[PDB]
Symmetry: D2
Subunit: 262 residues, 4 copies
C-alpha cells in the first residue's frame, strides 16, 4: 500500500502532536489502503540561525511521540543527528529518518541500521540520484532490511531547489522511493536567517511525483501554518490533507499501470 | 481540447513526413478530443558540428509540408531562424515555432507575430519561468493572438538539462503551455560532436507534465529513431505514439479535477 | 600583445562614442603595450522588454563607429544579429562579434567569416567550455583566420551567472580567449523586465582572469553609468578604466610566468 | 601573514605524516612570511563507499599529529565529525575544521568553539556565500574568537563543482577566508564508488584566488598522489608545493594593493 508520512515539522508541544495525530488517525480510518506514518522532529539541529527554535530535547520528544503512538495506534518516524541517538529513538520510531545534509555520514547510517528499525534517508541536495546506490549499500551492510530514499530537491543556483523527477525511477532500482512534497519547494536560507517556501507548488509537484511513480509521499502539516516554529513557509493546513490524499490515490490508480518495471 | 504537436525532427525526406503524417492522421481520427499538429523543421540552423545534417532548404521544406497538409488535412508547424523566414513559412505553417536560443530575439518574434499566425516560443535553457512574461508581451505588441510557451528543460550543469515543473503553472499565467517531452531529456553536446539523450525518461516525465497541468505536449517521432539524422537519441518510436497519447488522456482526465486556477 | 575591448554598450549617440573614444585613445597612447579596440552595439536585438532602448539603427550605427575610427584611429568591433549585417558591418568593424544567445547559429557564423574580418564569439550561457571547439571549427570552415572566444558567465540557477574559470585554460586550446568583465557579473532578468548586476565584483574577477591567463579583457564603460540606456548597472565609470588597466598589466606581468603552456 | 594549510588528506600512517611534515617544516623555514598549518584527517567519515579507507582511529590520529607538532614545531588542524570529538582533538589541534556537509550542524559548531581553539568551517556545497553569516554568528555565540570560512566549491549539476569567486569578497565581511585549492576541483561521486578530480586546474584557480584576495590557501599533498588512500585524483605531488607557494606570494605582492576594503 502507498505510504503517507505526515505530521508537524517540529515537536512544538505534545498538544500540537495530539491535535495533528487526531486528524492523521481520522485519515487512516478513511483511507484504509494507505499506510500512514506520523512524523515530527524532536530537534531541528541544522537551523540557519542560532536564534531559531530547535526543540524540547530528545527525551521529551520520544515521550510526545510515544503518546501519539499509543493514543492513536499510528506508526512513528523522526530524524536523528548523531550516532548515539539511534538507540533511544528506535524505542519509539518505526522508521528512523536520516537528514539530507547527513546522508553520507557512515556512522549515523550504520547506527540507525543497527537498531533493526526501518531507515529512510533524505537525498542530499548535493547528491546525484545514481550516487544513492552506495548509501543503500552502507545500510544493507549495517543490517537494515526496510530501506527508503526520499527525494527532497537538488541545489539549483543559490537559495533554490529543483526537483529532477528522473531521480524517482533511478533510485527505485535500489530502494523504495519517498517524495518529500514540502521540502522540495523550500527555498534554502531565503528569508535572511531562515529558509523560505512556495506552498502554491506543493500540490502540483505531488501530482507529478505519483504520476511518475514513487512508493510514498512525505508532507508536513500544521493547524496554523504561518505560526509553525519551523518551516512556516511550507506546512500544509490540516484541512487540506484529505483532498490531496484523495487526488494522490486517484492519480496513482490510473497511472500505476504505466509505471516502468524494474 | 488537448494539443498534441508531433512529427519527425527534421525534413529528411518526403517519404518520412508522409509515413509519419499518415500515422498522425490515423491517430487524429481515433482521438477526436485531441487537436493534432504536424511538426518538422526544414533546417537545423544550430547543430553543434558543421558536419551535421541541416536540411534540404526552406523551399523544399515549405513544399514538403504543404504535401502532408493537403494530403492528410493536418495543421502544420515549423521553426524559423531569421526574420525573413517569417512571411514565406507562414504560407503553410499554422503555428510558427521560435527556437529556444532565439526566444529573446525581438525581431524574430515580432516578424512571426505580424504574419497573423499562431506563435509558439520554446523557453530558452537560460530563461527563468517568470521571464516568459516579457516574451508574451512582445508577441502581443506585434499583434499575435494565439501564443504558446514550450517547456524544454533548463541548463543544469554541463551537458545536462532538468525540468523544473514549477514552470508549467508559472508560465500558464500569461500563455498556453506546451511540454516538450523529447528535448527535455536531451543532453546538450553530450557526445561532443552531437547532442545526446535518455529515452528512458521521456514517458515518465510526460506523465508528470499532464498530472501537473499543461495545454498540450510536443513529441518528436520517427519510424526508426536509431537512423534519425538528428536528435536520434530523443526521437520516440513511431509505433509507441498511440500508447503514449492514450496514457496522457487517461491521466489528464483524472488529474484535471485538481489543476489549480490561474 | 594584450587585448582590451572597451567602449559604450550601445551607440546612444556618436557624441557619446567620440567622448569615450577620446579617453580610450588617450589610454591607447599611454599603454603602447596594450591593443585597444572600440566596442559598441548599434542595436540591442535581445532586450527583455519591448519597451527598452535598442539603438538608432545599423545605418546611424556603422556611421558613428567610422567617425570614431577615422578621428581616433582605433580599431572597431560591434555585434551582428542576422546574416545580412555581416558584409555591411564588416566595412567599419575590425572584429565581428557574435552574441551569446546566437553562438550556435551556423549561418550567422559563416556570414561573419566570409567578410574576412576577425570574429569574436560570446560563449553561450548554456554552453560547456569543451563545446566551443565546434564553434571555432565552423569559423575555420567559413574562412576565419583570427578567432576569439569570450567568457561571459554560465547559467547558475535562475537570474544568475557564475564564471567557471576552468574555461579559460580549456578554450585556449583552440582560440584566443577574452574575458567579459562586465556581463560576467550581470543578473539576467534580475530587474523584472530589465537585467541587473553588481559592479562590485567586476574588478576582482578581472584580476582572477588575468591571473589564470587570458588574451584580453572585454569591459564596457560610460561617463555616467547610472544614466546609461543599456546594461547601466554593469557599466564602469570612465575615470576608472586607467587604474584597472594598470592593475591588469602588473598582474599579467607577474603571473604570465606561470600560465600553463598549450 | 598569509596562511598555507597543507598536509596529506588522511592520516595513512604516522610515517607518512613525518615525511610530509619534514617538507612542510622546510617550507616554513624558506618562507618565513607565511604561516604554515599542517593538516590531516584522522577519519574520512563521509566516504561514498562502505568499502573505502576511513582511518586508524581518533587516538592514533591525535598521537600522529602531536608527533608532527613536537618534532617540527608546526601548528596543527584536523576535522571533526561528531560533537564528542572536539575536546580530545583540541588537545593537539590549533584549528578545528568543520566538514562541508556538516557546516550547519549547530552542536558540532558549538562543540568546536567551546574548546577555545580556532575554527575553520568548510562552506557546504549547498550554501550561498551570504548564508555563511549565520555560520559565523553561531561560532561567536559558542565562544570562538578566531574564525575561518573555506571556499571549496559549489554544486554545479551532478558530480561537478564550480568556484564562484564572488564568494571571497562576500565572506570576508564576516571572517577570514581560505580557498581550498584541492577540493574545489574535486568531482563528487565522479568515479562511481569514489570521487575524481581535475588536478590540471588546481594551480590556475589558486592564482585566481590570490588575485581576487583571500587570507590563505588550503592544499593537500602526498609523496605519491596516485597511491593516496583518499582524494588521490586531487593530491599535489609533494615536490610541487614550493613552486606554487612562491607563485602565490609573487601574485599576492602585486595584487594586494588592489584588494578592496570590506
Ligand atoms: O556585448 C554585448 O552587447 C552583449 O553583452 C549583449 C548585451 O549587451 C545584451 O545581451 C544586454 O545585456 C541585454 O540585452 C540586456 O537585457 P535587459 O534584460 O533588457 O536589460 O553580448 P552578449 O551576446 O554576450 O550578451
Ligand atoms: O533555520 P532555517 O533556515 O529555516 O532552516 C530550516 C531547516 O531547519 C528545515 O528545513 C529542516 O531541515 C526541516 O525540517
Ligand atoms: O548538433 P546537436 O548537438 O545534435 O543539436 C542540434 C540542434 O539543432 C538540435 O538539438 C535542435 O535544437 C533540436 O531539434
Ligand atoms: O571518494 P569519496 O568516498 O567520494 O570521498 C570524497 C571526499 O570528498 C570525502 O571523503 C571527504 O570530503 C574527504 O576529504
Amino acid at each position: 500500500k502507498f505510504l503517507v508520512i505526515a505530521g508537524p515539522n517540529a515537536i512544538e508541544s505534545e498538544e500540537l502532536l495530539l491535535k495533528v495525530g487526531e486528524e492523521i488517525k481520522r485519515l487512516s480510518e478513511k483511507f484504509k489502503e494507505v499506510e500512514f506514518v506520523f512524523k515530527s522532529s524532536f530537534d531541528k539541529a541544522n537551523r540557519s540561525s542560532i536564534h531559531s527554535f530547535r526543540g524540547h530535547g530528545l527525551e521529551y520528544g520520544v515521550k510526545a511521540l510515544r503518546k501519539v503512538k499509543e493514543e492513536f495506534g499510528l506508526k512513528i518516524t523522526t530524524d536523528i543527528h548523531e550516532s548515539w541517538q539511534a538507540e533511544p529513538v528506535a524505542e519509539v520510531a518505526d522508521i528512523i529518518q536520516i537528514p539530507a545534509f547527513l546522508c553520507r555520514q557512515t556512522d549515523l547510517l550504520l547506527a540507525a541500521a543497527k537498531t533493526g528499525r526501518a531507515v529512510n534517508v533524505k537525498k542530499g541536495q548535493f547528491l546525484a540520484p545514481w550516487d544513492t546506490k552506495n548509501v543503500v549499500e552502507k545500510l544493507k551492510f549495517g543490517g537494515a532490511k526496510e530501506i527508503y530514499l526520499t527525494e527532497r530537491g537538488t541545489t539549483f543556483g543559490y537559495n533554490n531547489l529543483v526537483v529532477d523527477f528522473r531521480s524517482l525511477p533511478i533510485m527505485k532500482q535500489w530502494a523504495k522511493v519517498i517524495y518529500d512534497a514540502t521540502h522540495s519547494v523550500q527555498l534554502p536560507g531565503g528569508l535572511g536567517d531562515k529558509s523560505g517556501g512556495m506552498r502554491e507548488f506543493i500540490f502540483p509537484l505531488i501530482r507529478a511525483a505519483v504520476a511518475v511513480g514513487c512508493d510514498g509521499v512525505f508532507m508536513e502539516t500544521h493547524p496554523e501554518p504561518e505560526k509553525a516554529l519551523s518551516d512556516a513557509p511550507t506546512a500544509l493546513p490540516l484541512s487540506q490533507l484529505e483532498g490531496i490524499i484523495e487526488a494522490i490515490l486517484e492519480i496513482r490508480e490510473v497511472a500505476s499501470k504505466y509505471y516502468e518495471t524494474i
